[PDB]
Design an enzyme around this catalytic site. Sequence first.
Site, mmCIF file in Angstrom:
data_model
loop_
_atom_site.group_PDB
_atom_site.id
_atom_site.type_symbol
_atom_site.label_atom_id
_atom_site.label_comp_id
_atom_site.label_asym_id
_atom_site.label_seq_id
_atom_site.Cartn_x
_atom_site.Cartn_y
_atom_site.Cartn_z
ATOM 1 C CG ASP A 191 0.872 -1.912 -0.820
ATOM 2 O OD1 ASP A 191 0.989 -1.809 -2.056
ATOM 3 O OD2 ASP A 191 1.342 -1.095 -0.004
ATOM 4 C CB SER A 192 -3.842 -7.414 -0.981
ATOM 5 O OG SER A 192 -4.319 -6.391 -0.118
#
Lengths: 64, 576, 93, 49, 476, 43, 49, 39, 79, 44, 117, 257
Positions: free
Chosen positions: E107-108
């Site tokens: 989730d970056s």
Amino acid sequence: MIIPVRCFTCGKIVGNKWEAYLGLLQAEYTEGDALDALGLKRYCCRRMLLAHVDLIEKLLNYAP
Amino acid sequence: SLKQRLKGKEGRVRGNLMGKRVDFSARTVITPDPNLSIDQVGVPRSIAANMTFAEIVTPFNIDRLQELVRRGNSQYPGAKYIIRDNGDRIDLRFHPKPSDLHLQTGYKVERHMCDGDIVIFNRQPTLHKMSMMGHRVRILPWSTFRLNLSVTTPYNADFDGDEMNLHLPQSLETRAEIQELAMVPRMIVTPQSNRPVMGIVQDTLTAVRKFTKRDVFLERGEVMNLLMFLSTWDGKVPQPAILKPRPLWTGKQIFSLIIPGHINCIRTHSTHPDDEDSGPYKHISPGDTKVVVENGELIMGILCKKSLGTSAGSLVHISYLEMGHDITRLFYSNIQTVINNWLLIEGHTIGIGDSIADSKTYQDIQNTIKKAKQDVIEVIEKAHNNELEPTPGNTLRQTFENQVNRILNDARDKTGSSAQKSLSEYNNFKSMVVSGAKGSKINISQVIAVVGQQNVEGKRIPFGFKHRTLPHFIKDDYGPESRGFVENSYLAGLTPTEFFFHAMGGREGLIDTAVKTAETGYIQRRLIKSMESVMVKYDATVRNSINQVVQLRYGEDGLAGESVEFQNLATLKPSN
Amino acid sequence: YRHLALLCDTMTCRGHLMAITRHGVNRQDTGPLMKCSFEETVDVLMEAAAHGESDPMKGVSENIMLGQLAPAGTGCFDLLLDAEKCKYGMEIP
Amino acid sequence: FIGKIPIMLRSTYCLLNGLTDRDLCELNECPLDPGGYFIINGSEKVLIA
Amino acid sequence: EVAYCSTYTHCEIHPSMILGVCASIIPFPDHNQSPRNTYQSAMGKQAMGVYITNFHVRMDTLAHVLYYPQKPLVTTRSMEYLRFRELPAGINSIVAIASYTGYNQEDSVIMNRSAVDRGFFRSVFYRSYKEQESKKGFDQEEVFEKPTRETCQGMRHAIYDKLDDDGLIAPGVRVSGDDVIIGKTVTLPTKRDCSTFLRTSETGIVDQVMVTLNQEGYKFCKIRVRSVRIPQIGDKFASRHGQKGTCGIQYRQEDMPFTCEGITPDIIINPHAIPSRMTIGHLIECLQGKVSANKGEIGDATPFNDAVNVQKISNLLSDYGYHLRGNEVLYNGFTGRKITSQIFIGPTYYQRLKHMVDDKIHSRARGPIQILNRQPMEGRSRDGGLRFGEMERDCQIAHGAAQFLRERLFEASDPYQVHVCNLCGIMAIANTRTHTYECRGCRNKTQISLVRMPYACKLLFQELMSMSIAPRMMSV
Amino acid sequence: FHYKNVTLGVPRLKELINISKKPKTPSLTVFLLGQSARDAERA
Amino acid sequence: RDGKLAKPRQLHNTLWGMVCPAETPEGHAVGLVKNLALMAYISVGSQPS
Amino acid sequence: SACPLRTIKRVQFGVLSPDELKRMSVTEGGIKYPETTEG
Amino acid sequence: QKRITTPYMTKYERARVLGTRALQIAMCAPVMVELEGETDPLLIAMKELKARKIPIIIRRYLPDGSYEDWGVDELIISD
Amino acid sequence: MIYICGECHTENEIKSRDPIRCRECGYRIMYKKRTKRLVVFDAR
Amino acid sequence: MNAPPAFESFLLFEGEKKITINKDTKVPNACLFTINKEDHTLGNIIKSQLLKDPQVLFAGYKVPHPLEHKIIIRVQTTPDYSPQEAFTNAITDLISELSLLEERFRVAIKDKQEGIE
Amino acid sequence: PYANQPTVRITELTDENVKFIIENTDLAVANSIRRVFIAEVPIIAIDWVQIDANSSVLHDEFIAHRLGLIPLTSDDIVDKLQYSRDCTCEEFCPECSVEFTLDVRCNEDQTRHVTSRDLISNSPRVIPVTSDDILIVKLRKGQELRLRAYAKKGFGKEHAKWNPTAGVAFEYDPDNALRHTVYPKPEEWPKSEYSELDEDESQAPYDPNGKPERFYYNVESCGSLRPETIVLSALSGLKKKLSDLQTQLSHEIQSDV
Ligand SMILES: [Mg+2]
Ligand SMILES: [Zn+2]
Ligand SMILES: [Zn+2]
Ligand SMILES: [Zn+2]
Ligand SMILES: [Zn+2]
């Protein structure tokens, strides 16, 4: 608020184009036709004019 | 009153004495860094300057210490304060000139924290020792904490605004013991499960499966870049897998270089078939399953989630057993760096086209759904006739509901098989499912064919209106759509009645998970306080704080929990 | 198995079924300072003073409250520096 | 005199209601702003059903 | 047809109407997972966008404004009713699902540095501080005036030069963080001064200074500081389809992968995230967003309208000459070689989240301690030591690192030294000058010994002695 | 809820942590020493 | 919010058209706070006389 | 300081005698003034 | 020997001895084993433990209170 | 010192320690005049 | 500072050395060249020319950290040949190709200032 | 061990964009030059903005950011202008910097729109590129904006505004003989503009040995600097970097011996 001076991806000037784009909208050209009249072949440059909303006029209405 | 002054929670006797806020503690948002080593943790320069370690003056390193004294509260490497033998503390910034002050042997210098220092790195809530792992300080310009992908699996923290705390020991003995007991490479394995708590990150794991595919060929220049990145590389180039057309290295061969020394491990493939082993050509492995590693070199098969996963008997676990914890930490870093360099050239992608399936597959899915609905209608009419007979010990209404549910389940399984048949090796969604790093076969069935029945508390949606789940439905409607069954895939879209029933399933699931976390934490807190006193003595007898023996030997075997491993006697099971 | 075996063994060590609850901890052979840390400090301390009871200090909590090292690993043993081993040593400037 | 009752913004009793957008611009009140919040001690408070 | 009923009393005006304003902004909610839609409803409330057109007229603390707010390329018909388009909280960003340096994992989101330089996703922050003169007593009146060392008993080391003669900082000046912005003097029977300091590292130019009579009628002054913050890796950016993540890294346009056209995606997201959340709508929206830009007309995101189907959108893309799937051949920027696997790329509306790394980061070393318990306390810097958890102490006991646990428990907080005799457990009076301590009652100097225990423990023992129960400390 | 009614998961563990005289849904599995277990009619 | 009773927190069939299921704040209490549907209007009420 | 530093082997709790309290009390003759300070 | 306590150094004993030796080196302890150009006390302490030249005797406390005295050379490193 | 009255858009000086008011406008809200000093900015 | 200044990224400090000579005993006549404050563009062009050269047995270019500005290049040559000579030869070949390309491009613009017609 | 001789053919030459093809050159060389044009070529853009007074709705910082992005003509004096840090002369002076002063007052009831053309430059060669006029801000009646600005030489790496060209299109090997990119369905994929593939041939047949060649580069520029001039400057700049590295190596070997 006001049109960004340069396209976010290419960096091609969009601020001068926005005044021309508004004139094309005033004329028979539709939003798609106005982008075609500009002749940009890249979606990013077309997206900046299409997605931009001018909030500067609302700020101008309020007394200083 | 004086008795009132004594307090429990938020009180001096219990809240303050047992737990107190600690200095030398730093908190900031965490962002993942593949390049950083597992021991190394990225620290913002401003936090590092604020944190300080007291250092005794030493004649050998006096020149470095005097340089730190010369720059006070200005350069990042500097001493904020100097403590003399008398113990008086002098501020360099307040003092007019730093140079006039002179260092003497035995002086204490408050040097700012620097790379190579040892700190304790822990998540905000610690439910186990693995949550708190000692880390080696590393400095990066941006204000964020940078940690290796391998260390994330024990931490179990998603990178969405999450923050972690690091504490710096000011005592040599405390720092030394933290290195001996809490170092992150030493803590890679867990005693409770006798297996590593560290597993390869999903992005690397899917790439590893693609890398270990038989059809992977690497050019000589690309291989040289991978060798340059590998720390384990000995500076000697391996002989190429293909030589006459051009020098070429297979992906499995490059992975063999990453594997350290000579560790021998066999792991069953995630998609490996039991039938293949019973059938001939089991050793030949036509499907490239049955992964085998011999002499520290991958020999056959495709690496799978099980092989590099956080489980006992894993290739990483075998590396820990023979190579040692420090080499295993290097091995984890090597896999990520090589995979990333290969991944950019290979590419990774997901798309609506991968989700979409051929029209013939969709027609097959529609046919099975139509048959199931007709079968449900036949059951409903037979129930009205009373031809159906209730199973003994069960209500007629319950048996009618159960049989209708069975018809829906069999149809959903048939639609799911059709969704699997549509998937292809080229399709990206299938490749992620085959690795098993992310996604699932059941998820694919919901995406392409049928989402499945939606229920609240494991029961079909009740009739909120009188005799009707919704006003649109008729009174006494037993139709599957009325009871919340969804026969429409996510890609197909959901009807408003189905969407409302799907929302009910989501709402009930959200409530249970939130309530469950509070209950499990509370019971664990009581248990942890109760069992903290129990400990093993010098004689190895487990005893309470009172010293009453709990067990003569720890675990009834007097052996470490991590050391024991599963083995087959192969004596009782065979016939006499 | 070792973790599971220990939890049942400690619970049955008394010889009666005991729930993991505050009341179960209150009935224990633990010293008054442990009870003081358990929020029953006022009653136990008055009782201890009246009967002249003395805290054992066996508990880890009692040592940490006084700032002494807890009697856990790395604390039970005491080192004894010896001169005979020291004699074959090299002085450093 | 009985007392003073706080007035919800944009209510018929409130001055802002019944005013043209140009009048709102002079008072520096946005026509877009929904209103419906009481003002107490120069702070915005809205009752919750 | 074979309808359930042919005499329905009433009909729904529209299925989409039931959805709330937060639900409407999400495109294709039915395609997206139901929990993901719920998560985005929370994200929409905390999204950073200009609250009202006349933001300047009202001074609001922690105000968030967007430098270049843009309408979404795909808009639900319901979104127009709530006027989201009139005051948008997000700027459209080109999005590609791909894995590059591994920063995008977990989730970056990778970001383009060149776009940040152009001001894409830039934000304006306003913070308001209000001080009112207090006159509880005639001697206790607190007129605002510039503090001077000669006239002020409590003047701080920080210079008061920035403050005007009125004691209010001039508008349009730039004031550094932790610097006094308001100067007030309380009359003393010289006079001690009360000064309000700027938030640490505020770095905000003063937008305006206002002096007005309060409702009470005492002098009242409001100061507003304006700070411009560029997008950062710590700052969180949230996708419309229930996705939120921190920025993994920022790269130059040449560093970022380029298409045959040379267009570079503003934001790059990991491919693994989309299957886990099963956001079918997000992939459809990316295809629709590229289609809308080529079409030149805004797309419709209404969920039950069924106006646009995935095949219909793909057919429109093929008509434009783009690949129907929307995958585009891309070249790795550093290598200059076309990537083996084509990467699907589509514009996705993105809203910046309120949470920012700069507010979160804090560290405390040798901070001032409270007199009552000697506990660590936050200073003017506003940085305070993190509390050691009870569970954290238990984890240390499991580790067996007793020395480290003792250092945090005793040395770190309130370390204290006490004197006691073997028999007498009373706190013997201690005189530093004499260097000799005596348990009063038995007058003993041989029996006295030095014990180190926490200050909180020492005061607790004194309180017990007041209660008439004496804890007795014996060396043997 | 998915399995008659049995206690399983964190609530069953909570029942072990706090001993209860009566479980939420008490049941005992019964096995028959006699030949009745082998044949359904005798059972 | 502390109460964990499932029935108030759970979405109900009658809620259709009167509340938005998606617009619920996440946290210790789930579904306790709800937002009314845009079409749904709270009735002012009228005299029954 | 000059006094040696040693750990406490055991802690004993017993009622505090009034007579010993009087001997160790800082004040002599007790406190006869309710006011904290006269002027 | 005839001692229930293990002849091999315990992991906890090893950690304390390494910390103590490192603490002595930073203070300015004479080095039984010469450092290999190392300014880090921990690195010298680990080499000293391998040498077994450290002058430390560990007293082990039994439940009955009997004491077992083990020299660093007699103790075997756990790792 | 000098203050600006928003309602009448004119600048009237306000005495220190004197109740705030505007001449012929009766306005008690005042805004301090922009500082004479000029602050440099970076185009970047 | 939380944000590194742009000028520092492309500018070497006076103490910093643009090129570092390192000796590798892993293979005979192998030398490691490290260039500080260098963009990815220069490293890619140098590695390709070394790969083209038959004398250079091994040519590898890598960047240790993206946030850090540095490039590492490894050159391995036959024992008679010198690795430093190979590195300089690669630089000269690149300069010769660029200068010839610049002359050709200038001639091409001169040939068609107004285009072919 | 000798570099191949490159051949240059120009498809089109125009101020708006230049299309050129280079053949007989390495893929790494082709990629490096494309990156060099975008970031290694210097342009003159405003770096310093000071606003004496601001009455516009946009804050002073907002106006300063817009001014730097606006392009300034740099065709002939990029070489003549010197970096302020490099030059020993005063940072604000004509030789190292170009001064831009704008003073705008709106007295008409209609709003007056501030434009890039309004900006006045002490040096004639550096001017805003106006032939429409970019809108910096709109001024309401009774509002006056006065600012002083200085323009400093910078290359693309330093800032996006300093980059002198728009996105550059680079492609090679349109027919997939090399099979660098493999299509699951070749027929679905559209043929490339430069592709020689016939309509019947969905994808090119694989070749065992392939060399990247005939790379196509299209450079689009704001017009401050001619695109062909940018290419000529870039070739010299890359050559200078190699020469500087060789000079550093020659000093390093001399130090060793
Ligand atoms: Mg999270
Ligand atoms: Zn563009
Ligand atoms: Zn005494
Ligand atoms: Zn006035
Ligand atoms: Zn100058």
